[PDB]
Amino acid sequence: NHNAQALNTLVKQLSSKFGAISSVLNDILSRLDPPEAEVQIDRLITGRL
Amino acid sequence: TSNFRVQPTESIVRFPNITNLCPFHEVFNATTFASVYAWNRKRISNCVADYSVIYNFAPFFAFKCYGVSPTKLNDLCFTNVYADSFVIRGNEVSQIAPGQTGNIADYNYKLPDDFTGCVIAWNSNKLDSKPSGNYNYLYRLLRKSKLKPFERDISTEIYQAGNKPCNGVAGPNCYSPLQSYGFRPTYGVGHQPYRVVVLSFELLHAPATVCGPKKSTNLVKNKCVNFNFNGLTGTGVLTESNKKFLPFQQFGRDIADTTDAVRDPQTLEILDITPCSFGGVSVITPGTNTSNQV
Amino acid sequence: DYSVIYNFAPFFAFKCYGVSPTKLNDLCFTNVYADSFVIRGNEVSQIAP
Amino acid sequence: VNLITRTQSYTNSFTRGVYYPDKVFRSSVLHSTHDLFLPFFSNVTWFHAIHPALPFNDGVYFASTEKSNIIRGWIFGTTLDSKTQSLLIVNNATNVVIKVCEFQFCNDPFLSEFRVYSSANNCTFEYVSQPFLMLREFVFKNIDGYFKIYSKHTPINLERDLPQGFSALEPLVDLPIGINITRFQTLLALHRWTAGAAAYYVGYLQPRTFLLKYNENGTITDAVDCALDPLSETKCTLKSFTVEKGIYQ
Ligand SMILES: *[C@@H]1O[C@H](CO)[C@@H](O)[C@H](O)[C@H]1NC(C)=O
């Protein structure tokens, strides 16, 4: 159960905003200007790391 | 050592069918315009959205897109397309920006700080100035408090600067907030009339209804392709699924908070989305001095 | 009492950085320093942190 | 003048008012949402109208048990005149008509639609779809500029059906602006006038987190209101309807 809980927590936190506009990477890539895209991508990276 | 992502082979776009077009014209050629305090907000919905007509028009003084990349406008789908047409002075164009404060910004029309869309401002000085005077265009420079985002105030409230109401008459601490623009052909940039259309977009989980032209290539089942089903872009393998979606919508998801199943804008067929096969590669080798076979 | 400031003429640039303009009356301050001068209109945007 | 008189009583909401938070399918999962829900076991105003305005708050749950189509519409507005935007819905025997015109309403409008409104003028939106009415439950919600009505029809044996009945978003959003909506008035249908009774049920929505169970077929089958009682809060914080014996923070 602990293992399943850890894995589920990881998968669930894959969808966290972490201060970004959206949790979907492709949406930000195809939706934002390259500097703002870099900023939001860096935020998501910090959260996922 | 490395991964093994099964690279996709083809691409399928399955944007829904409407094959019609957008008002996008009567929100730009419209003979007459609106004030900044009294600004026409039209909701464009059900369309194909060919933004080529925008580029077909006159050059734009400030064609600044905040939430969306200007070149990628046709590719993504948007729920509601909004046309906000009004006339403001040239130096006041900069005030129409998310996170930027100014008289026109706060007392006439405040965009949201997280606004997503495009502001299309072009000079319209070719035919806006008349000898009589362009008093039709008006703006508010006094209000009790700051305007909330996407708010309209057209009522003329008596400015009660003092502790006693002005009672609707002129006197000390009694000034009308409304001010009429003065438009002259010989005036430089900053006082010349500028036509500004604000395209407000709203990305959310309702049917696109407005999605730049793209023809859907046919579907490809058991295989590994990109899918673009009403704006949700991804990678996976489309397989027949036994799930029975209620008529509500198509964005099927599982416990992993991932798009497990989706419905297409053709049949209401529900396809389960599974990730394309991938894994990690490992090299089993003996000692390097022993042999080089791996 | 900052209401007298609003009682004057409309302000071209009433920019408050560290304090919300509406919260001015509620807050307490240790020192107030009034710096007055005259500059041209296009030079106003240079007076900022 | 005033020619409709209503009598008020109070009743228990039981476990009605659960609606689908989004158009996302789910199977055999427990979901936690924070939305404008109808609180479980709350006061519900029961109105009997005989041949009267109500506030809107953040959302209204409207229930009817009528048979011979005594109710035939709804009216929404802030001033209930031509001065401010309104939203008028009429349910004839053939279709539904939704209008966002600047209708000026009577002091006691009632149901050819000559009596409900005196005049019509410049409008904003118009919608014609299949009729809503064919226990009828409706949930109104105007939060993020959109207008949402969720509807459901269940059979009758005795009183309000205690078992859980989900409300499905069939009529979808009208894409209005709806202005600062602050009130709500109902529309009862008379005939070409001996007697007439109505069975309005009005309940108010409130920001509250609920936990929803989806069966194998994607249908809500049970729900728990986290703020109802300590047991419900424990169920919410454990993400399970069943709770093992013990002590939980
Ligand atoms: C789920 O749907 C299937 C239809 O294939 C039906 O046979 C079954 O009874 C349903 N189960 C429930 C609990 O509604």
Swiss-Prot record, chain A:
Superkingdom of origin: Viruses
Coiled-coil ranges from the UniProt annotation: 1-41
Function: Subunit of the fusion protein that is processed upon entry into the host cell. Mediates fusion of the virion and cellular membranes by functioning as a class I viral fusion protein. Contains a viral fusion peptide that is unmasked after S2 cleavage. This cleavage can occur at the cell membrane by host TMPRSS2 or during endocytosis by host CSTL. In either case, this triggers an extensive and irreversible conformational change that leads to fusion of the viral envelope with the cellular cytoplasmic membrane, releasing viral genomic RNA into the host cell cytoplasm.
Name of the protein in question: Spike protein S2'
Full protein segment contained here: 953 to 1001 of 1273
From Swiss-Prot, chain B:
Outcome of mutating L138R: In strain: Delta/B.1.617.2, Epsilon/B.1.427/B.1.429, Kappa/B.1.617.1, Lambda/C.37, 19B/501Y, Omicron/BA.4, Omicron/BA.5, Omicron/BQ.1.1; Contributes to cellular immunity evasion and increases infectivity
Residues carrying sugar: T9, S11, N17, N29, N289
Receptor-binding motif: region residues: 123-194
Segments for region (Integrin-binding motif): 89-91
Effect recorded for N17Q: Reduced viral infectivity
Residue numbers spanned by region Immunodominant HLA epitope recognized by the CD8+: 134-142
Disulfide bonding pattern of the chain: C22-C47, C65-C118, C77-C211, C166-C174, C224-C276
Region (Receptor-binding domain (RBD)): 5-227
Result when mutating H205P: Increased resistance to human covalescent sera neutralization
Disordered as annotated region, ranges: 5-21, 141-176, 205-227
Domain BetaCoV S1-CTD: 20-213
Reported effect, N29Q: Reduced viral infectivity
Effect seen on changing K130T: In strain: Omicron/BQ.1.1
Assembly and oligomerization: Binds to host ACE2. RBD also interacts with the N-linked glycan on 'Asn-90' of ACE2. Cleavage of S generates a polybasic C-terminal sequence on S1 that binds to host Neuropilin-1 (NRP1) and Neuropilin-2 (NRP2) receptors. Interacts with host integrin alpha-5/beta-1 (ITGA5:ITGB1) and with ACE2 in complex with integrin alpha-5/beta-1 (ITGA5:ITGB1). May interact via cytoplasmic c-terminus with M protein. May interact (via N-terminus) with host bilirubin and biliverdin, thereby preventing antibody binding to the SARS-CoV-2 spike NTD via an allosteric mechanism.
Protein function: Attaches the virion to the cell membrane by interacting with host receptor, initiating the infection. The major receptor is host ACE2. When S2/S2' has been cleaved, binding to the receptor triggers direct fusion at the cell membrane. When S2/S2' has not been cleaved, binding to the receptor results in internalization of the virus by endocytosis using host TFRC and GRM2 and leading to fusion of the virion membrane with the host endosomal membrane. Alternatively, may use NRP1/NRP2 and integrin as entry receptors.
The protein's name: Spike protein S1
Lineage summary: Viruses, Riboviria, Orthornavirae, Pisuviricota, Pisoniviricetes
Gene name, Swiss-Prot/TrEMBL: S
Curated annotation (Swiss-Prot), chain D:
Reported effect, I156V: In strain: Omicron/BA.2.75
Gene: S
Residues bearing glycans: N2, N43, N92, N122, N180, N217
UniProt domain BetaCoV S1-NTD: residue ranges: 1-238
Result of changing R72I: In strain: A23.1
Effect noted on mutating A49V: In strain: Eta/B.1.525, Omicron/BA.1
Disulfide bonds: C101-C123, C226-C236
Function description: Attaches the virion to the cell membrane by interacting with host receptor, initiating the infection. The major receptor is host ACE2. When S2/S2' has been cleaved, binding to the receptor triggers direct fusion at the cell membrane. When S2/S2' has not been cleaved, binding to the receptor results in internalization of the virus by endocytosis using host TFRC and GRM2 and leading to fusion of the virion membrane with the host endosomal membrane. Alternatively, may use NRP1/NRP2 and integrin as entry receptors.
Result of changing T65I: In strain: Iota/B.1.526, Mu/B.1.621, B.1.1.318, Omicron/BA.1
Effect after changing D161G: In strain: Beta/B.1.351
Protein name: Spike protein S1
Reported impact of N91Q: Partial loss of biliverdin affinity
Effect noted on mutating D108Y: In strain: Gamma/P.1
Subunit organization: Binds to host ACE2. RBD also interacts with the N-linked glycan on 'Asn-90' of ACE2. Cleavage of S generates a polybasic C-terminal sequence on S1 that binds to host Neuropilin-1 (NRP1) and Neuropilin-2 (NRP2) receptors. Interacts with host integrin alpha-5/beta-1 (ITGA5:ITGB1) and with ACE2 in complex with integrin alpha-5/beta-1 (ITGA5:ITGB1). May interact via cytoplasmic c-terminus with M protein. May interact (via N-terminus) with host bilirubin and biliverdin, thereby preventing antibody binding to the SARS-CoV-2 spike NTD via an allosteric mechanism.
Positions spanned in the full protein: 16 to 314 of 1273
Spans annotated as Putative superantigen: 215-236
